[PDB]
Design a protein around this ligand. Structure first.
Ligand SMILES: *[C@@H]1O[C@H](CO)[C@@H](O[C@@H]2O[C@H](CO)[C@@H](O)[C@H](O)[C@H]2NC(C)=O)[C@H](O)[C@H]1NC(C)=O
Ligand SMILES: *[C@@H]1O[C@H](CO)[C@@H](O[C@@H]2O[C@H](CO)[C@@H](O)[C@H](O)[C@H]2NC(C)=O)[C@H](O)[C@H]1NC(C)=O
Ligand SMILES: *[C@@H]1O[C@H](CO)[C@@H](O)[C@H](O)[C@H]1NC(C)=O
Ligand SMILES: *[C@@H]1O[C@H](CO)[C@@H](O)[C@H](O)[C@H]1NC(C)=O
Ligand SMILES: *[C@@H]1O[C@H](CO)[C@@H](O)[C@H](O)[C@H]1NC(C)=O
Ligand SMILES: *[C@@H]1O[C@H](CO)[C@@H](O)[C@H](O)[C@H]1NC(C)=O
Ligand SMILES: *[C@@H]1O[C@H](CO)[C@@H](O)[C@H](O)[C@H]1NC(C)=O
Ligand SMILES: [Cu+2]
Ligand SMILES: [Cu+2]
Ligand SMILES: [Cu+2]
Ligand SMILES: [Cu+2]
Length: 547
């Protein structure tokens, strides 16, 4: 239950381009944290790298413990080069696959890895014990320094350069330059079943994913078992994890291929905008088949076309919590407070005496309810703990300030603009929230993976167009809605979720596309202390990084 994570400057080559990246213990992707349900894990983080950094345990509630949650300038100031900080990871309701990642700037492009939470002793999976288990991390690779990619977009006000490759476990795969020799490979044995622990650790795109010749039985997401369902492909958004069983059925007598491509490729609908649309591949190999069975290329799966919105919708519609006696659910039935939260990409005016590269030569930005979040220089959590004025404003609104036909295409240029602020939403302990995310069509309808730190939530509804508060709740799933920490809000649509705000602390909510995070598609929930010691935020640890 104890790890040392040393942030290292590590030389890595992909696509024949060598660079020095930030990595953890010289590993890219970083090491896997293994735990069992309800463990407490300690991670000592030693920043031996060249820049300010933080780490986050994605999807871990961290009850009463925002001090170890990680988001830069939200719960802590950064771990400075040469400093260290000890994180306490408190696992509770989570069982399945989560992941950890840097939560500063774009550092998670290389600083990330898996979290595996096994059933605690005396319990078992709700499915037959897999023969083997394999994390499958989807990610991106840039040849340039990721920090320079970020800094250039900050200077120009234009869009972030697209990655040069999509990756599986750090490796672009068979169809990229200088990549075929080190394509990720896993061995399978006929008749055995494998648990694929799929994590989308990329920065930019929802991804379709599939394995040639093999159906996938999905059994969990975001640390919560799902009602099982079998598919030919999945959709997975940055922030999300998806667990699925693969059954190695294909013949090993030489009558069938012994090698099968695992493959992923973006789901992306904006034809006007650049995307790293390259697929990434890995190989499933049946090891006890004859050499002739691997004479040709591995078989390829059919992936939905990149703009196949129906295929995305059809996967997401199948997600439902597993509800049994061993795995109960608690859907909040009576809502104390409703929020409508419009999600937009935006512009702000270019700075004086400068030309910017964003739409209309303005500077790109993003907003929730038309507030574009800007990080403070004193982290929110210290400001809340010490009652420091002038850091944040506690009036993030429950509804957009101007109602319009949110999803109508090509809104007029005057609706592009937004305004910066550091606004948070303060709620009493135990408040039951229904949060409805409403995508707008400003600068292009787009699916956004909205993520809430400190909580999972029940996704009770979704649809296309504008949420109708007097009609859409009538068909909510109040029985087995999926329990997620990151929800794909539909392209040009809405998603409704509910949760009890019963975790006292300071909790980031943001789109899990990093460019939208930095542009300001974020806010913060401060959940005040309740009554009793179990409803009190933990005290500040003695060695928090200084601001
Ligand atoms: C989001 O906020 C921006 C900035 O506050 C709004 O743009 C302003 O709109 C008023 C008119 O209502 C103008 O007088 C200002 O000049 C605008 N500021 C600009 C363009 O920088 C924008 O209308 C809001 N959008 C919404 C609520 O959808
Ligand atoms: C690395 O993080 C530290 C801590 O946030 C930054 O140092 C602070 O910078 C602010 C200005 O925004 C000053 O008001 C504080 O006095 C600084 N605190 C220190 C030095 O302990 C530092 O700027 C960050 N480095 C970079 C490159 O952003
Ligand atoms: C880690 O940081 C603390 C200060 O917060 C320092 O006293 C300690 O010596 C550092 N090094 C370790 C723990 O190896
Ligand atoms: C971003 O891409 C453009 C090509 O469209 C290139 O000119 C520029 O150098 C790239 N930026 C960085 C930081 O590599
Ligand atoms: C990946 O893309 C390459 C280049 O377009 C293509 O030749 C290959 O068939 C693709 N692989 C899969 C599995 O889709
Ligand atoms: C800066 O901008 C102002 C206002 O647009 C302009 O009058 C001034 O000439 C600019 N400064 C230069 C070009 O050095
Ligand atoms: C909103 O926009 C949609 C899409 O263009 C359109 O079909 C619908 O009629 C609009 N609704 C109203 C009330 O104008
Ligand atoms: Cu995350
Ligand atoms: Cu998180
Ligand atoms: Cu987004
Ligand atoms: Cu986050």
């Amino acid at each position: 239950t104890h790890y040392d994570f040393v942030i290292t400057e590590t030389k890595v080559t992909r696509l024949c381009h060598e660079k020095t990246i930030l990595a953890v213990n010289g590993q890219f992707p970083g090491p896997t944290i293994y735990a069992r349900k309800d463990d407490v894990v300690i991670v000592n983080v030693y920043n031996q790298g060249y820049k300010n950094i933080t780490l986050h345990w994605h999807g871990v509630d961290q009850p009463r413990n925002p001090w170890s949650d990680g988001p830069e300038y939200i719960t802590q100031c950064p771990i400075q080069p040469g400093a260290n900080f000890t994180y306490k990871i408190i696992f509770t309701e989570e069982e399945g696959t989560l992941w950890w990642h840097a939560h500063s700037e774009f550092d998670r492009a290389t600083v990330h890895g898996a979290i595996v939470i096994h059933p605690k002793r005396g319990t078992v999976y709700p499915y037959p014990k897999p023969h083997k288990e394999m994390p499958i991390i989807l990610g991106e690779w840039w040849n340039a320094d990721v920090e320079q990619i970020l800094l250039e977009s900050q200077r120009t006000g234009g869009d972030v350069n697209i990655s040069d490759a999509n990756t599986i476990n750090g490796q672009p795969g068979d169809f990229a330059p200088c990549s075929k020799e080190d394509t990720f490979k896993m061995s399978v044995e006929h008749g055995k079943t494998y648990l694929l622990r799929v994590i989308n650790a990329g920065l930019t795109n929802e991804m379709f994913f599939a394995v040639a010749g093999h159906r996938l039985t999905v059994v969990g997401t975001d640390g919560r078992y799902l009602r099982p369902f079998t598919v030919d492909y999945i959709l997975i958004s940055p922030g999300q994890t998806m667990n699925m069983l693969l059954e190695a059925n294909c013949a090993t007598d030489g009558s069938a291929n012994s090698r099968y491509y695992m493959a992923a490729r973006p789901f992306f609908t904006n034809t006007a905008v650049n995307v790293d649309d390259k697929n990434t591949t890995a190989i499933v190999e049946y090891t006890d088949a004859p050499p002739s069975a691997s004479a040709g290329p591995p078989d390829s799966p059919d992936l939905p076309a990149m703009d196949d919105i129906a295929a995305a919708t059809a996967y997401t519609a199948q997600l439902r919590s597993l509800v049994t006696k061993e795995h109960p659910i608690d859907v909040p039935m009576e809502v104390d407070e409703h929020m409508l939260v419009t999600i937009s990409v935006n512009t702000i005016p270019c700075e004086p005496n400068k030309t910017c590269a964003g739409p209309g030569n303005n500077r790109l930005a993003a907003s929730l309810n038309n507030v574009s979040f800007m990080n403070p220089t004193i982290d929110i959590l210290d400001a809340y703990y010490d009652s420091i004025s002038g850091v944040y404003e506690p009036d993030f609104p429950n509804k957009p300030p101007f109602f319009f036909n949110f999803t109508a295409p090509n809104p007029p240029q005057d609706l592009w603009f937004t305004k910066r602020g550091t606004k948070v939403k303060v709620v009493e302990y135990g408040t039951i929230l229904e949060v409805v995310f409403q995508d707008t069509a400003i600068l292009g309808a787009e699916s956004h993976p909205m993520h809430l730190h400190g909580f999972s939530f029940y996704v009770v509804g979704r649809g296309f167009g504008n949420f109708d508060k007097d009609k859409d709740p009538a068909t909510y799933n109040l029985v087995d809605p999926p329990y997620q920490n990151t929800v794909s809000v539909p392209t040009g649509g809405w998603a409704a979720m509910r949760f009890r705000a019963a975790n006292p602390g300071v909790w980031f909510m943001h789109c899990h596309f990093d460019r939208h995070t930095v542009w300001g598609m974020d806010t913060v929930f401060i959940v005040k202390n309740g009554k009793g010691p179990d409803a009190q935020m933990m005290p500040r640890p003695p060695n928090m990084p200084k601001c």
